[PDB]
Symmetry: C2
Subunit: 321 residues, 2 copies
């Protein structure tokens, strides 16, 4: 017997391949996926004539190029790994408590919940890799399975295993781009040796790892100079649409009574002897809204180990320092 199928790697371009029913899909084409399931070792099963197949191996020159333009430069196990994740995360629930989406707790995915909910608050954000954008747009439309699977694929997350939210958030942002002007100017100087300016722009200006408050970010750093004197590092200019600050689990008392400038923050929970639980939290109304994967809580004060903290747009100059 003989059947003919449609073969794609992107869902846009298709080629027709004629297959017999003696050999396996593996020996005839390569690693093929049909509606989620891997069928590489199976014999072309009669009734599946004229169906679309997603290929992962033995890509043609045209397929390799289109694969690169859509996903960017990825390792050759990326597709199999991405398709497997799409099928695995299909039974995951997004719940919307008062018009805010959150990922339900399933198979240690609370780190993803923190990643997604933090990404939702970032404005003027665009992904340079086309496949991420299409999935990002789908996610914003209510269909988030592609985005989750891609984030796990690019982050090299395995299904079922716990992971780091900050780690994943920074790796995802590396693939993103800002739609407006951002500027960050650091000043390194010595009273004898002179002045040096370091300028960052784009998402580079909007992200910082080391400090978790804006007062600490603007503070002056001092160490020994080449000349034997003193060197100083301090922020001079800062113009952003928003500011994300990150650090390791750092215990802080968070209070609404002081009216904090930050909009939201992530929290690592559980003792260091048994690690793997994240919580997203937003400041809305006069309260702290705690999002523990589906469930929602409210407190005015909270002593917690904060990791990532998101601030509004900065517009600052070092006031006569």
């Amino acid at each position: 017997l003989t059947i003919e199928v449609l073969v794609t790697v992107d869902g846009v371009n298709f080629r027709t391949v004629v297959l017999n029913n003696k050999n396996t899909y593996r020996s005839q084409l390569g690693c093929v996926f049909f509606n989620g399931a891997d069928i590489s070792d199976t014999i072309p099963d009669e009734k599946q004539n004229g169906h679309s197949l997603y290929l992962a191996d033995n890509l043609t020159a045209d397929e390799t190029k289109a694969l690169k333009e859509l996903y960017g430069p990825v390792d050759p196990t990326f597709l199999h790994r991405f398709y497997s994740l799409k099928a695995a995360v299909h039974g995951w629930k997004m719940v919307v408590c008062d018009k805010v989406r959150s990922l339900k707790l399933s198979d240690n995915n609370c780190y993803l919940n923190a990643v997604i909910m933090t990404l939702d608050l970032l404005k003027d954000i665009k992904f340079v890799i086309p496949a991420l954008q299409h999935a990002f747009m789908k996610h914003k439309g209510g269909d988030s399975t592609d985005f989750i699977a891609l984030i796990m694929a690019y982050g090299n997350c395995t299904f079922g295993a716990p992971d780091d939210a900050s780690r994943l958030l920074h790796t995802v942002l590396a693939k993103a781009e800002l739609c407006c002007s951002a500027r960050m100017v650091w000043r390194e100087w010595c009273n004898v040796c002179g002045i040096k300016d370091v300028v960052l722009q784009g998402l580079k200006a909007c992200c910082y790892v080391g400090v978790q408050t804006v007062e600490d970010l603007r503070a002056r750093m001092t160490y020994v100079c080449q000349c034997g004197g003193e060197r100083h590092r301090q922020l001079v200019e800062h113009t952003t649409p928003w500011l994300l600050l990150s650090g390791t689990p750092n215990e802080k008392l968070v209070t609404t009574s002081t009216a904090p400038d930050f909009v939201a923050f992530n929290v690592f929970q559980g003792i260091e002897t048994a690690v793997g639980h994240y919580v997203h939290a937003r400041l809305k109304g006069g309260l702290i809204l705690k999002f523990d994967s589906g469930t929602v809580s409210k407190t005015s004060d909270w002593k917690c180990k904060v990791t990532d903290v998101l601030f509004p747009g900065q517009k600052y100059s070092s006031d006569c320092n």
Copy 2:
């Protein structure tokens, strides 16, 4: 009181920082490591004056640049993640059964055993990222903790979790480079539409995912053409120092009686319902040497699910096809 310390991110360049005993290391410097252990939240502990500290946060312009030149472009959680792994994999054993090193079974690291043992057989291989080379040279000298920790860091492997050997092997090789000439020429053609040649070189020529035998790699692929006729894909020229072929767990009968051309291969073991066990195997003498993380076995025949397969240097032209 007041103490002064040496701060590095590379072990080469050091700056002197003067620290008081009121604040934490975190608020004064940032994320600091001393002899493996994270001490960011601790108060500068008196006797640790004039000691070297490894910093992960709040890097100076000079530190950021040197960090980039040594490790390449990495996400801002890379250092903390790398230092934590160095301390974690310190109690791992390399055993040498008849002048061949293998990584002992510990915390599901059998995938690393396969990765390392396969890398050991690759000749004329050099890493473009300086930190990988220094660790690779250390590894070859008998000290492998740095290399393992780096591979886990770049592969985004977590300590204790199982992982994919092919996945890791391809991501590691992406950072490598060949010290000689390699060439791979694929020919895509149609009898009506014409001929098109696709040329690959370097490690690109020495690696292929899709087929696991050289006969299949040289075989002709056929599908429907744009013109309505037939398109063909076939390898024409192939000159390499060695050839690595990869595929998913594929059940094969491996026999020494046929005298196979391949030197070594990796095997995925265990049912798909409970995944996570790899085995490295080399053909030496008249037998198959099975390396199951420390332990060694011998058989003449073996029905197993092969993944990666390594061949000697290719020198081939399509013989009047």
